[model samples]
Target: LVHVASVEKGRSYEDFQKVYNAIALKLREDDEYDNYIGYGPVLVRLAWHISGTWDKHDNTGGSYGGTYRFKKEFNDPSNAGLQNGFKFLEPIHKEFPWISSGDLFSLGGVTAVQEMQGPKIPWRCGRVDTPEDTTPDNGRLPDADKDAGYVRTFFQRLNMNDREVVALMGAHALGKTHLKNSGYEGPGGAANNVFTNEFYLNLLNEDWKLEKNDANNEQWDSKSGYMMLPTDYSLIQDPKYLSIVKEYANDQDKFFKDFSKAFEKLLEDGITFPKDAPSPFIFKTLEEQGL
Candidate 1:
């Protein structure tokens, strides 16, 4: 017979809720970063970077470890500008020292998307810390310089289909591509603070010009002062991704639904959820609670 370990009764829904409240309050207070662009965008990016390290085959790297807090992982050249996200969370960690780094980092992403008017992402706890050797090697994160085929090939390793890839890239809309971060510059939407399907809309509707930023990397710039990476623009350049882009651009609800699924899967990529695992928990947004 197989034996199963019982969950620690120490942490419960209420316990996680307190963690959620700490994150939510901090987000409200820290409204100035990236030129008053706020913490929401970087929080989402932090989540993406942490989770993007997964490889579906061996499950070697993923958000489960919370290794990004380590110097080796944090100093990865590709992780430029993420120090802001880490610094922003330092106070929260200090206040609640008990929450595992993995849980806190992932929760920051969930809280950011929800607080930014995006769909509520259902999240769970139980990520434990690991040694520095568990830190994933650099270069796992997607390149802004790549094309559609490369994007498709890259996500295959993560088990993301065309639709999921397209939906996940919609995150570009919420934050600008910092020149220092990705060697690209400019925001992807009019409202960078709010999560919306504007990325797809901008891709389809904007009159984009192929131009080089100060970093000399080519990107698609729009008349509205927005921009898209070559990889980001490829969503509409390809037929399969184009269909999903159109679907999301036309229906906010559809975008929210698909994005919620894709984002959850992105964060939960490598972790094994047991058959009896709890369903994804949908936390209330700060706005919903009038916080």
Candidate 2:
């Protein structure tokens, strides 16, 4: 049940950074995806879904396993729209065939976030792929149609606290949910591809109406054309979650820092790193590199 950090043979920070650059460059070039929202948001969601399967109780599923390459995890109902992300990474994996799937998948997320002008997520380069049988069964990810209590309880299995849950959900600001995929529809904010605290701001500022979407699912909609899943709106509904939501809404810098920490921890769960394992690498965005 122990998964140790095994750095890919002859791979180092520079090696991973080159892979990071490839993913970032492709993200910039593929500008027509998701109706011009680019591959950024789906890439982030793919990383989250792949890592979100971790269960602290037994530690069977997590990003450490990279089991999403298998049929069961790829076709997971919760992973409906993520095929786009897999297709996006296929070329990068082909070019650099040595990086483990877990490493590449998680790195796609880091690259996406940073390229979208979000925070720097210091990521490790291990995560050797586990066997296909290690893929956790479906239903481990949280349902969007739930409430505050449900949100809190479900994330408990992932070992995230109230603040971590709220911060991570800020990723909602990155992409719209589609009706065909999740039985819900609409963007969470104006900038659908940029990572921001807008999910919190919109949650607090919008006059949302509880209405049924075309998918017949109840969601909070605003006249300005933004939407919030029941679980997203629950942040403002619960007293404790409301406080943290307010904090993040008011302070972008703090939100970015906390999100970086929480996201790195989320992806790293279920793995044990040796003391000799190299330090995590914080990648530079293409803009930072003047590319």
Candidate 3:
């Protein structure tokens, strides 16, 4: 089934901007979440998780359906901690009821990234709410306890290449892995809330030791109090992925530009846009708006 972009009735760029501004302002106001790491990282994770379920073979799961609102997807074992991200957007959805769940969820990530000084991710609206039955069965997301080969094979279902995989994993730089949520714990870098190439730099520069966490899951721990999931560490373990990681670590702007394109494509998977569809909206960060 082809999922075409159908802009919400009577909605335009300004309407979505209003929703974006609301999310951004709340992001500024809610300062103590996740121990002051704020909601940005979780928001980014929310967007990624929602879109990460896409399968290129049949395209049953993806950001297209907004089915994450359903219990099956929301209660997904892989989605344990994302409830926080969903809760954050609840109020925004309440105020702007016109915005579809998929758009709000995907747009939340874009706003969080841009507002936290990451990069501008041009967003398109129009993901109608698919029925709960349409929600993809659980276990479609990746496992943290895997290696380079596993990582490569897992993302193939989502159609991400080596460069895109490495770039998207750069989001690991934003949030800590909580033991309660995913059996992994600790921030990947010092600035957990700010978006940067630190994930790559840390992967390249850290004196890492293989160790188990409080949850008894093995992770790569660094002397500087950072950590890397097995899958995350795999980026550097694989020769091809390592090259892209190094390139991102060495050049900040290039990472941002590349990440923007990859992330937008990830979210847009499984959806078709007609020739007459409006251009993707490039939102202005609150800082740019002088808010």
Candidate 4:
């Protein structure tokens, strides 16, 4: 029988809401970190990296296991610079001892997005941690230097289609790539901390020049102090992806709506919500509740 994580007994929406509140409040209090973007983008990135490991083919690496808590997964090369987010969430885990590591990691992204004025990502909670052996080996994450074909093939393992892939990549605008971290540097644009369609816009509008960074890897650079991964630039290189990019670049509302759905799907990749499990929870941001 496949093992499924059990939901917390007798817990309700209010319980998860309390956890969300703590994350939102810490995001506020930590404004002095990461150049005042605070923990927002890192939280979002951490969430992505955790869930991003999912492989629909075998369902081996995913948020369901909460394996990132283990040292092996924690020290993954693809996960460099994400320790900041994991460390940040550690105290939150201490505060809410009942929530599983998978729940905290994924929920942190939902909270970070809505709090940063992005979109409300409906989330469900129930993942209980599995053993360290369930932790997938590294190298399942996407490569920054890949092309459109590689990008398409990479996400195919995770069951994401083109539209979904484009919507998810919009998240690139949230955080800058650290040179020492991924060997790629600079944000997609000036609004690296906020969730927006700036990635598509910059990709369409930037006067990018192909150049090799210190790591000797090819990346697209602009005078605006921004850079695009080879995978990011692929969006415009392919006709199909370019069309979607134009659509997102042209309509922020469209991008937000698509992004919300894709982000939700990304987080819930391999989980099976039980018949009696709670319906997906749409969390309210602190500002929405006037907190």
lDDT of 2 by residue, 30-59 (tens): 999979999999999999999999999988
Q: How much is the lDDT of residue 138 in candidate 1?
A: 86
**Per-residue CA lDDT of candidate 1, range 63-137, in tens?**
888899788889889889989999988988898787778778988999999888899898977677778988888
| Whole-model lDDT values for every prediction | 0.84, 0.93, 0.92, 0.89
Worst 10 residues of 3 by lDDT: 124-133
Clashes of each: 0, 0, 0, 0
Off by more than 4 A, model 1: 1-9
> Lowest lDDT 10-mer window, candidate 2?
129-138
lDDT of 3 at 87: 90
Evaluate model 4: give its TM-score: 0.97
Error of 3 at 34 (Å): 0.8
lDDT of 3 by residue, 1-291 (tens): 788888999999999999999999999999899899999999999999999999999878999899999999999999999999999999989999888899999999999999999989999888888888999999999989989999999989999988888889999999798999989989989988888888889999999999988999999999999999999989888899999998999999999999999999999999998888899999999999999
* Model 3 RMSD in angstroms: 0.7
Ranking by lDDT: 2, 3, 4, 1
lDDT of 4 by residue, 1-291 (tens): 254657887788999999999999999998888677689998888888888998887778888888999998899999999999988898989988999899999999999999989978989988889998898899889888889999999999889999999999998998788888888877789987778899999999999999999988899999988999999999999998999999999999999999999888888888888798889999888888999
Q: How do the predictions measure up, each by TM-score?
A: 0.95, 0.99, 0.99, 0.97
